[PDB]
Amino acid sequence: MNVGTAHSEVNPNTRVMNSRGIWLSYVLAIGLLHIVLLSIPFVSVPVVWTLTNLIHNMGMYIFLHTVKGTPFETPDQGKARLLTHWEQMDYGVQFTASRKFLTITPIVLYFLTSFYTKYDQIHFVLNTVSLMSVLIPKLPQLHGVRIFGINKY
């Protein structure tokens, strides 16, 4: 369908994270990923937890801070052809329940995966690097800024 047939909003994308049941689906997706990773027979539990953390963080980074634009043609004439999804969310309003939830969840996952890996240092460096790679773009300061001009266009 065409954008605007049943709703006046020029950019539906901005609201996809405020819909009914998106949070529970996201949490259940994380849970299903963890179950699938635990399913592997020859892999130890700390490795399973660190794999869960790394995979979830990489996917979240790709979907929220890398892919820019919209998957559908929008009738505001390409205003967001350069913005990523995190910048598009809620039309740039910086603090909102959705953004708070999306920032909080990786930290809780980090606590859990740190405890279940018995605080091993080799796992610690990877988990902290991944958590920082996710949490750094979430800052309001890094809104519409690209370091060394990567992913500008």
Partner 1 sequence: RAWKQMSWFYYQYLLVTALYMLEPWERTVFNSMLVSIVGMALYTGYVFMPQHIMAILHYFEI
Partner 2 sequence: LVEMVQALYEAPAYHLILEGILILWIIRLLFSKTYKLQERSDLTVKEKEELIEEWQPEPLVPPVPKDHPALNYNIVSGPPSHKTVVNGKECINFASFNFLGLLDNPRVKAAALASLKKYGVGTCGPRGFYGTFDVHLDLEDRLAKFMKTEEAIIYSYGFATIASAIPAYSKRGDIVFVDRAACFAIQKGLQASRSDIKLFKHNDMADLERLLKEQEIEDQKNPRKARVTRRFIVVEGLYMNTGTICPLPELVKLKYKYKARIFLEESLSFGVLGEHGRGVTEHYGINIDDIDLISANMENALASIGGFCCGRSFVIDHQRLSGQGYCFSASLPPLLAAAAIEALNIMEENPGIFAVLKEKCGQIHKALQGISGLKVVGESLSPAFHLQLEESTGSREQDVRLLQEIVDQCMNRSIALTQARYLEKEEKCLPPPSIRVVVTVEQTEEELERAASTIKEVAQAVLL
Partner 3 sequence: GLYKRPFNEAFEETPMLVAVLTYVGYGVLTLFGYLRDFLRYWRIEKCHHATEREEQKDFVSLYQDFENFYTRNLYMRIRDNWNRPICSVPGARVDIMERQSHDYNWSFKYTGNIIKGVINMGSYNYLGFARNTGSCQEAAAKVLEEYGAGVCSTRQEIGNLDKHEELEELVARFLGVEAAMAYGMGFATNSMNIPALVGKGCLILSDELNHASLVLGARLSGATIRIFKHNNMQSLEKLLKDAIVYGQPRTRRPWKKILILVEGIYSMEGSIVRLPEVIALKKKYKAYLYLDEAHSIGALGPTGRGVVEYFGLDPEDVDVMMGTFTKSFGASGGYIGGKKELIDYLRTHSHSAVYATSLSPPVVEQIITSMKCIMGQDGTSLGKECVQQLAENTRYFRRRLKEMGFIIYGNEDSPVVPLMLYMPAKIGAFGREMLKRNIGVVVVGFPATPIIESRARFCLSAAHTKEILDTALKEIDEVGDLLQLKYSRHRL
Ligand X SMILES: CCCCCCCC/C=C\CCCCCCCC(=O)O[C@@H](COC(=O)CCCCCCCCCCCCCCC)COP(=O)([O-])OCC[N+](C)(C)C
**Which residues of the shown chain bind partner 1 in the complex (CB under 8 A)?**
35-36, 38-41
Q: At what angle do helices 45-65 and 22-39 cross, to 10 degrees?
A: 140
DSSP 149: G
Helix ranges (DSSP H) in the chain? 22-39, 45-65, 85-88, 97-115, 121-135
Q: Which of 6, 7, 8, 77 binds partner 2 (CB under 8 A)?
A: 77
Nearby residues of 47 by Cβ (< 8 Å), 6 or more positions away: none
Which residue, 42 or 148, has its beta carbon nearer to partner 1?
Answer: 42
CB 30 within 8 A of CB 112: no
Q: Which of 6, 140, 145, 150 binds partner 2 (CB under 8 A)?
A: 140
Which residue, 10 or 82, has its beta carbon nearer to ligand X?
Answer: 82
CB of 92 to partner 2, least distance (A): 5
Contact residues toward partner 3 (CB under 8 A) are 1-10, 12, 15-16, 19-22, 24-25, 28-29, 67, 69-75, 81
